[PDB]
Design a protein around this ligand. Structure first.
Ligand SMILES: O=C(O)CCc1nc2sc3c(c2c(=O)[nH]1)CCC3
Ligand SMILES: O=C(O)CCc1nc2sc3c(c2c(=O)[nH]1)CCC3
Lengths: 225, 198, 225, 198
């Protein structure tokens, strides 16, 4: 398969809403060992997200009914979903660590992937237990704050990747570490650093960034009420 | 319409003649140059103070406004999205618009692309940053203070993409011309690819 | 697994929106060899439908792009979807013919299943080619008209199963046989036989039946314009 | 309120006294029995002909309507959904309602559960079939022709679930009381399980 044939087949599974195909689809273009443009960089992330978010929306419901007469076989069924996500993230984290993280020649994608890698460490940290429960979070903040200084010292404040990295980080503290103290602490800092420099917006994604900011202001106040 | 061009030279004189040959190329008329110059800076604060409040126009200001709005269709748009700015002494005509919706001023929309004149230009109450094309690049006729100005129309509708308030309490805001909208200024799928909480 | 444990696990895959699990889930309660109540009768049909309709919505898009420079590997990808549906319907048609059709003690379900069996013969008739193309349609009208006389001579006119069987039949002629002459011919007959007897409505599904009638009137006129 | 009960015996006499002990049990009052009987059949065609057209009431008819609407809260509802019927000489107050929406008459809604009186009752122009509870089971007070009647209020809103026209051109229609709505009368998931085209 040519480096461009899979592009079409990858776009197919998306429009066909067959992202499990899109999973292995964009998996191959990165297994080519060559850097991928933002076009493909977007598709792969869009692929695995919709897949993981799908199992996520599936798992999150079971974890509400069992809490809310046998329910062991319900946990046993929830376990096979846990088994699915665990298999997914750790699979994609190797794809991050093998062909994505080092190939990051461009400084922009140097933050998108690390943000994504921390997300999939943030994803796995929910269904985990004991051994991985503490371990997954260690690399989570590791990869998170790692890209943050890059976003801090190199990236513009009002930049889509930087602002998104701050949100997912602010969500990681409130959700994972259940520490809204530092969660709210990191958003305002990022939020404040954004409004002071409004001339830092790019017309290419001027509207794209504002939406992100509209979310953080709707998380600070939300957490403080 | 030379009669309009005479209207300013019958009511302002050397003031109106201050701007005239301010034109390498000339997409605008003789009457269009003097009119835009008269507004820009500085005979304009009362052109909007009278437009707003629905109040009645003066003799000369009516001669200006009509010459001004006329040049708009004769000027706009082209060619890509620009990044103007505008600060105020508080109370801007966009504080009542819900976030995500579209609203238009009564008066005009003088702006600047220089972030320094953005913070500010009497005063530092409410600061904005705009996007569009239908603005008149007057960064040649009247650049007092080197403001490099671009001026939009009046009833032109703006999309309040963001409205927050500063730590020191200066309300910085983002805007966007109505006729852009939707996916006008979005990274092609960069958003979907970030993955978020929401 | 008890005949009632799978009920809960079947309801799980539905709420979890994991119908591929729901496929094999309700597959087992019917493999029990005992008759299934309408509650379970509804779930299984709801299960395989959402699955088949999902692949259907997937396949129908590819069959628009290829029609609308290589596209062989696109047909090759469309083929694996064809392979999916073929595997599905013929699998469920055996489940119909083995544990569903004979177990039909109740006269009501005697029409629901045959209607469904003709549907899955109607489903397979689209992706087929040559050998099965003509063969699948033979049992399609067979099972269809078979339940129709049952619906005609035994079922009330304004009955949900009867009115639905007429619609899917009217859609089968216009879509499959591409013969809107008899398609429109069968709907009006059924439609007319419905409005004359309005006292034939049951309060249990009085609103459910009206919706069906609202569809046929929106297919006759549609086909005649 | 005996004074109301006297209102009919001061204005109808032996007519009003025709109905009185028509009551094994008595969820209704003396004045409620005679009033409902006076409408039902047959002193009622002009109670609605005057309600509709917004026209003014007569002496006695005002004494009826007020006694009638009063008994409604005193009667409705209970206990499950019923299946009344109603045909007309054309022009029913539901021909302007869009299919799927809710509309209410001006006058009242006399009905029957017998499909024969359904087709018809002067005339066979427009035929309907209703569903609800807030109807007054008067199938005891006045069953002229053995109609077994159930009567709903006036401004009670009905959901036009279907509106078609017959081969011979008699518009048969389905209706449903507003306060039922949504999944009031749906086979539990039988619909989703049919699978259709749409
Ligand atoms: O009075 C008004 O119409 C709004 C106040 C206002 N006027 C002006 S003129 C000018 C600017 C400006 C402004 O920001 N506000 C920025 C560059 C040149
Ligand atoms: O005049 C009206 O209010 C509607 C016409 C009408 N009246 C009556 S009375 C009655 C019925 C009826 C009707 O169907 N229409 C059916 C059983 C007893």
């Amino acid at each position: 398969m040519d480096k461009s044939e899979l592009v079409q087949k990858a776009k197919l599974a998306e429009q066909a809403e067959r992202y499990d195909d899109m999973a292995a689809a964009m998996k191959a273009v990165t297994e080519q060992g060559h850097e991928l443009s933002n076009e493909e960089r977007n598709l792969l992330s869009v692929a695995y997200k919709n897949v993981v978010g799908a199992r996520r929306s599936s798992w999150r419901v079971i974890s509400s009914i069992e809490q809310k007469k046998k329910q062991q076989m319900g946990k046993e069924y929830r376990e096979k979903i846990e088994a699915e996500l665990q298999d997914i993230c750790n699979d994609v984290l190797e794809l991050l660590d093998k062909y994505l993280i080092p190939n990051a020649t461009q400084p922009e994608s140097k933050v998108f992937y690390l943000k994504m890698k921390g997300d999939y460490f943030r994803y796995l940290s929910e269904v985990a237990s004991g051994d991985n429960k503490q371990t997954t979070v260690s690399n989570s903040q590791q990869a998170y704050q790692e890209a943050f200084e890059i976003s801090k010292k190199e990236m513009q404040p009002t930049h889509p990747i930087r602002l998104g990295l701050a949100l997912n980080f602010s969500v990681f503290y409130y959700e994972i570490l259940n520490s809204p103290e530092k969660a709210c602490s990191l958003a305002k800092t990022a939020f404040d650093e954004a409004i002071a420099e409004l001339d830092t917006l790019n017309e290419e994604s001027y509207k794209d960034s504002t939406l992100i900011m509209q979310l953080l202001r709707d998380n600070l106040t939300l957490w403080t009420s | 319409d030379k009669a309009l061009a005479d209207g300013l030279v019958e009511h302002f004189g050397l003031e109106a003649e201050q701007y005239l040959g301010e034109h390498p190329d000339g997409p605008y008329s003789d009457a269009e140059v003097m009119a835009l110059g008269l507004y820009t800076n500085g005979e304009y604060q009362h052109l909007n103070r009278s437009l707003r409040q629905g109040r009645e126009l003066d003799a000369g200001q009516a001669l200006i406004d009509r010459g001004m709005s006329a040049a708009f269709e004769k000027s706009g748009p082209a060619e890509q999205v620009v990044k103007t700015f505008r600060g105020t002494q508080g109370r801007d005509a966009f504080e009542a618009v819900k976030e995500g919706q579209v609203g238009h001023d009564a008066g005009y929309l003088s702006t600047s692309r220089d972030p320094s004149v953005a913070r500010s230009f009497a005063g530092q109450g409410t600061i904005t940053t705009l996007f569009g094309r239908s603005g008149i690049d007057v960064s040649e006729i009247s650049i007092e203070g080197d403001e490099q100005e671009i001026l939009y129309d009046k009833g032109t509708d703006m999309r309040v993409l963001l409205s927050a308030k500063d730590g020191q309490g200066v309300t910085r805001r983002v805007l966007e011309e109505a006729t852009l909208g939707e996916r006008s200024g979005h990274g092609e799928g960069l958003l979907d690819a970030l993955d978020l909480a929401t």
